[PDB]
Design a protein around this nucleic acid. Structure first.
Lengths: 119, 85, 301, 61, 151, 291, 155
RNA sequence: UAAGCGCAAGUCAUCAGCUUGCGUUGAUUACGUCCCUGCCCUUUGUACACACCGCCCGUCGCUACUACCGAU
RNA sequence: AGGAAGUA
């Protein structure tokens, strides 16, 4: 924003900064550079971490329960069993996060819902 | 001055390569000898300084040889390229 | 630094990267300057001659290793940011590779420079790649999109993008006949793509879990998939029908990394095969995952 | 009219004319050398044994 | 130069009837004079697609070999210009390597390396001739199929 | 997949809500810039808003791009505006008639990249799941009364605005084969922003055009024109017989269409927010064209 | 219809070779008046040989569907094709073409060719003309690449 | 998918002389080819190889120069 | 100014 505001390197690095940081997941709209001026924040990074984003997806009840579950290794992001509690989850990888394969938690979910299958 | 505008633009491009690499690393990459003969020499209009013309066959064929009919057909062929392009 | 008995060759090892080099100190020249990969590899293949293996990594380079003599003969650096896949055609002239840069680069290996770098219209990051054996058709597939992109080599454009899957397609393979593409996706499904005739048709293979890998029998009548249980299964291709299957979950368990507070035989995450191949006869399979054991099965028994 | 069994090697792509009639390349079965091309109605593939009557037919469309 | 224009009209009126005639030597010479060369390529293609090949010759017909030996400096190097222009085409490469072969057999490596843009000329001839040579070598190794098809 | 398109619905509606939150700071910012440039009168609340000056200097250039017309408006269309070729299905009601399948035949025959499915017995979340997985970028539905059709429902994907419209004055193909080139869209009388939304959901329904010689190349025209919020479409084929004359011909279905609904969200979203509906049974609803 | 084109052109060239071998025997008998009475499709192109007629109508077919029209060829008219590849390899009329389509025709028809006898005699003939043609042209081009090497080293 | 079968609803336009959902049972026969009827596009481009083609054609127009036929 | 023609 210190460039003269008709410039093309401004009008392209605005869209790449905003689209990069939005599709990352830290911003929440990609139409305001003032949102980077006071809305990018280490709390926004930290809420883009993995136990908070699965608390928000309601994979657990609290960040302590979800953190304990992802240090015991029940989760995966995509295809790989993630055991890092600081694993930053991006906005489209907030869809491919679920329980791992032979999960006692997942048998408790299907067991609660009265639809499990030992096959 | 344009030296200040372009020095600022190159410093901002350096900043965006460093920062954009660090962002893709935080997301763990979930973001968005020689030469051919036709590149040594290929026969064309810039290669022929002629009263002839290098054809699409690569062969120079001269207008003085060309009769009424063949100059006629090359007019209608290049005008076919104008009606397409 | 070590130094020759003659005094004519100097040898230098830089320990952070690979970086071994031998240096003639009076005829100032690199008799050797070689380097490994400073990041994890992602793919290897062989030339159909069988004399050189090519491998790609997350370092960004795709490099060409000679089986004899133990050196890399080429290192291609024109991708950035990690190279996922790597393949040849029938011919062994052209090295088709794919990367998270968003691009499938089609290298000319006799001239050591690329024909054609394809990419997708919207920006992607391709994680899987399969070229037709008569190498005039490219298929690639990503995690960001979950359609499958097909380019044409003898034209240069994009021939199609193909539908059908409810998840990121995670293994692509053409048949060595070259009549059938096969997609294996995280919609827990596989897919027979019959492109080349007048009916670009599909034929799904409802599986039990997320498809990790797909490999062809070198005669195209049978195909194997790795799926995320840890189980391999074997399918007829002409009349699409499962013929066999292994549950290899216990066979692959290379157990207890550190930062495992779980025991070695309870970690789900070392109990699946990332990659499978058949042998050139068509009798044994290689199978291997995020683990310690490479697992060599058979097909008939 | 003796019956001569016969099989198929090639399927003759760009030739076949007048409808669904597939014209096909035919390798004889008892003497496994003599190969004529025949006209076949219906769905036919490679490695597909065809039964033909009198083999004095050399015609096409 | 109106009389020179009448000389051009007159010698063109000779060369058309000369190609109508069965002789080719003074159409090679009179076409290296008239400098319109697509029919010069038609003359070398005619002379190598003659029915009569004799003797143990360089191009086919007898006079053409030593009219290439009795051709001059700018005429021969200008012919090297149009043989780097005819060597590129793969349809007229076999009718340019043969008269190019007569040229390299006749003149030595000092007449041909005599000066009058020579480097990239014979470089371009070199690379295109190497391309078509690799093609016909692969054709030879496919002709051993016929060698096998006997027994 | 389903988690992807659900989170894309939710994130899209959230960003649209942030547009409605930033409308007043956008108009206030535009008066700040235009009163910097033009002349000295400026409102003292605008001159006194101290966050507006900083967020101004960070956010000038995108409003410059709007006034210049550079950037594209966030929408259910402009993600893939004119690059992708929109595949569009057509289907009917459950047990269609002879006249209804013939009408389906001629309206898939109207759009070029329009496939036609037999209905059969296909549960409608399997229509949106089927077109959701094989990326039919628009489906249109058909409804009859006794074969003579009475409604269409265009509805496109992943979550785009469906339009529900009744159907009047329908003449089919008469006694006697129609070309399929990329057609010529004209739209007459869409003066309002609702007219701009229905004109956008009709003009991204057809295959786009390479912009070089669209003015002359092509012989097929498709004409939408509204009198009294009841749009028209005819289908004509034309040969331009001079440089100043043209000969048209009616080629297909003589068509008029009364839209009664514009619902954001797809064909299954019978709970999602409409943007428009016919206000019959209000008392001054029959005196307005667009709303 | 392209396989019909090379079928009927192959037959017209075959009867053309029949008329010039009858006339060639008769002019080996005497210089008496012996009318060859050639075909009024050959005389419209100008008393051409069957080599350039059948060669040009094999160059009309575009070489994607060359193996299609070539692959519909029946075993009845395979031998006349081998006769004209004997002539094309004799007088050297586009030897990558007669190599290429020769090797398609044998590469399909091995067991009929290796089971026959007469086309192994004419196959011996086209072996001789083919090997002499590729041999000669290969030797010319090798001499030219050597000569271009010596001149380019000479500068 | 075609075809049979009932059930439910009546959602501001349309629809009870019916409309629209919903389940139940569920095949034969093509799934190849452009030969017939057509429709679209090639012979210009769009990046580059190892490979391959080898100058598509007819009828008027627009201009530029050269020289005429008949008035003034 | 018109009429008819050539070449590029």
């Amino acid at each position: 924003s210190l460039l003269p505001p008709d410039n093309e390197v401004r009008r392209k690095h605005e869209t790449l900064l905003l689209d990069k940081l939005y599709d990352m997941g830290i911003l929440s709209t990609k139409a305001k550079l003032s949102a980077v001026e006071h809305n990018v924040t280490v709390s926004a990074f930290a809420r883009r971490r993995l136990p908070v984003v699965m608390t928000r997806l309601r994979m657990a009840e609290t960040v302590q329960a979800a953190t304990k579950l992802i240090e015991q290794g029940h989760v995966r992001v995509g295809v790989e069993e993630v055991r890092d509690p600081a694993f930053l989850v991006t906005r489209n990888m907030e869809d491919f996060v679920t329980w791992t394969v032979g999960s006692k938690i997942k048998q408790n979910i299907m067991k609660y819902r009265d639809k499990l299958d030992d096959f | 001055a344009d030296e200040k505008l372009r020095r600022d633009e190159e410093e901002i491009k350096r900043m965006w390569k460093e920062i954009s690499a660090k962002l893709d690393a935080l997301s763990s990459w979930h973001y968005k000898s020689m030469i051919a003969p036709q590149e040594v020499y290929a026969p064309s209009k810039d290669t022929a300084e002629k009263g002839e013309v290098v054809t699409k066959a690569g062969i120079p064929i001269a207008k003085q040889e060309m009769s009424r009919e063949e100059k006629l057909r090359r007019r209608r062929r290049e005008k076919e390229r104008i009606r397409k392009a | 630094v070590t130094i020759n008995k003659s005094g004519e060759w100097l040898a230098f090892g830089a320990s952070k990267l690979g970086q071994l080099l031998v240096w003639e100190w009076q005829s100032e020249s690199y008799i050797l300057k070689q380097q490994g990969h400073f990041d994890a590899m992602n793919s290897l293949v062989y030339s159909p001659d069988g004399q050189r293996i090519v491998t790609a990594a997350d370092d960004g380079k795709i490099k060409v290793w000679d089986v004899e003599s133990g050196f890399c003969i080429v290192t291609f650096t024109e991708h950035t940011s990690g190279v996922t896949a790597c393949e040849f055609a029938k011919k062994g002239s052209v090295l088709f590779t794919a990367s998270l840069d968003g691009s499938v680069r089609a290298w000319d290996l006799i001239r050591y420079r690329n024909f054609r770098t394809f990419t997708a219209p919207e920006r992607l990051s391709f994680t899987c790649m399969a070229v037709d054996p008569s190498g005039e058709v490219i298929a690639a597939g990503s995690i960001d999109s979950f359609d499958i992109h097909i380019w044409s080599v003898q034209t240069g454009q994009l021939l199609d993008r193909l539908s059908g899957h409810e998840g990121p397609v995670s293994s692509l393979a053409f048949a060595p006949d070259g009549s059938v593409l096969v997609s294996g996706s995280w919609d827990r499904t596989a897919r027979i793509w019959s492109i080349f005739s007048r009916t670009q048709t599909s034929e799904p293979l409802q599986l039990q879990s997320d498809v990790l890998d797909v490999a062809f029998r070198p005669d195209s009548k049978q195909i194997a998939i790795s799926t995320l249980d840890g189980q391999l299964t074997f399918w007829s291709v002409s009349e699409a029908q499962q013929v066999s299957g292994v549950d290899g979950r216990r066979d692959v368990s290379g157990g207890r990394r550190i930062t495992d507070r779980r025991t070695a035989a309870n970690v789900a995450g070392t109990k699946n095969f990332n990659t499978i191949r058949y042998s050139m006869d068509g009798t044994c399979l290689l199978a291997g995952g995020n683990s310690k054991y490479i697992c060599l099965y058979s097909t008939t028994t | 009219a003796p019956v001569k069994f016969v099989k198929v090697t090639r399927v003759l792509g760009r030739t076949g004319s007048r409808g669904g009639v597939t014209q096909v390349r035919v390798e004889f079965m008892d003497d496994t050398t003599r190969s004529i091309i025949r006209n076949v109605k219906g769905p036919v593939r490679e490695n597909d044994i065809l039964v033909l009557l009198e083999s004095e037919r050399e015609a096409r469309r | 130069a109106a009389q020179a224009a009448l000389k051009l009209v007159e010698q063109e009126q000779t060369l058309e009837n000369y190609i109508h005639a069965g002789a080719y030597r003074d159409a090679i010479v009179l076409a290296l004079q008239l400098n319109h060369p697509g029919r010069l390529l038609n003359l070398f293609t005619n002379v190598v697609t003659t029915r009569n090949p004799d003797p143990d010759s360089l191009t086919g017909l007898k006079a053409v070999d030593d009219v290439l030996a009795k051709l001059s400096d700018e005429q021969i190097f200008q012919l090297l210009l149009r043989l780097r222009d005819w060597n590129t085409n793969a349809r007229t490469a076999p009718v340019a390597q043969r008269v190019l072969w007569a040229l390299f057999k006749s003149h030595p490596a000092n007449k041909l390396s005599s000066l009058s843009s020579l480097n990239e000329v014979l470089d371009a001839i070199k690379v295109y001739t190497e391309r078509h040579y690799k093609r016909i070598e692969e054709l030879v190794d496919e002709s051993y199929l016929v060698e096998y098809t006997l027994r | 997949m389903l988690r992807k398109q659900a989170r894309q619905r939710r994130d899209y509606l959230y960003r649209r809500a942030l547009l409605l939150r930033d409308a007043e700071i956008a108009e206030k910012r535009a008066k700040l810039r235009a009163a910097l440039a033009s002349g000295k009168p400026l409102d003292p609340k605008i001159a006194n808003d101290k966050e507006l000056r900083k967020d101004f200097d960070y956010d000038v250039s995108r409003d410059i791009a709007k006034e210049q017309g550079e950037i594209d408006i966030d929408d259910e269309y402009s993600e893939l505006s004119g690059i992708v070729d929109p595949r569009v299905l057509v289907t009917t009601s459950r047990d269609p008639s002879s006249r209804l399948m013939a009408f389906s035949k001629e309206i898939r025959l109207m759009f070029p990249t329009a496939i036609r499915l037999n209905r059969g017995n296909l549960i409608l979340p399997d229509l949106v799941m089927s077109a959701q997985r094989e990326r039919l970028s628009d489906i249109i539905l058909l409804h009859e009364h006794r074969g003579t059709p009475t409604a269409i429902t265009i509805s496109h994907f992943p979550h785009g605005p469906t339009l529900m419209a009744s159907l009047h004055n329908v003449v089919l193909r008469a006694d006697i084969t129609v070309s399929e080139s990329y057609p010529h869209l004209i739209f007459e009388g869409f003066r309002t922003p609702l007219g701009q939304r229905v004109v956008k959901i009709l003009k991204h329904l057809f295959p786009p055009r390479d912009p070089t010689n669209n003015a002359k190349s092509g012989n097929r025209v498709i004409t939408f024109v509204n009198q009294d919020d009841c749009i028209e479409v005819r289908h004509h084929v034309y040969v331009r017989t001079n440089y100043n004359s043209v000969e048209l011909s009616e080629v297909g279905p003589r068509f008029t269409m009364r839209p009664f609904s514009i619902t954001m969200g797809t064909l299954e979203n019978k709970d999602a927010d409409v943007e428009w509906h016919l206000s019959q049974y209000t008392r001054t609803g029959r005196k307005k064209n667009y709303f | 219809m392209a396989g019909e084109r090379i079928a009927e052109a192959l037959e017209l060239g075959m009867t053309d070779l029949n008329t010039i071998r009858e006339w060639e025997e008769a002019r080996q008998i005497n210089p008496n008046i012996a009318p060859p009475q050639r075909n009024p499709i050959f005389v419209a192109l100008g008393n051409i040989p069957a080599e350039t007629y059948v060669l040009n109508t094999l160059q009309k077919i575009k070489p994607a569907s060359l193996h299609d029209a070539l692959l519909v060829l029946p075993f009845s008219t395979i031998p006349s094709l081998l006769t004209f590849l004997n002539l094309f390899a004799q007088r050297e009329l586009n030897v990558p073409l007669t190599c290429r389509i020769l090797f398609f025709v044998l590469k399909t028809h091995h067991k009929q060719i290796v089971a026959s006898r007469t086309m192994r005699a004419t196959l011996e003939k086209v072996r001789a003309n083919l090997r002499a043609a590729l041999r000669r042209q290969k030797d010319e081009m090798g001499f030219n690449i050597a000569a271009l090497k010596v001149v380019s080293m000479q500068l």
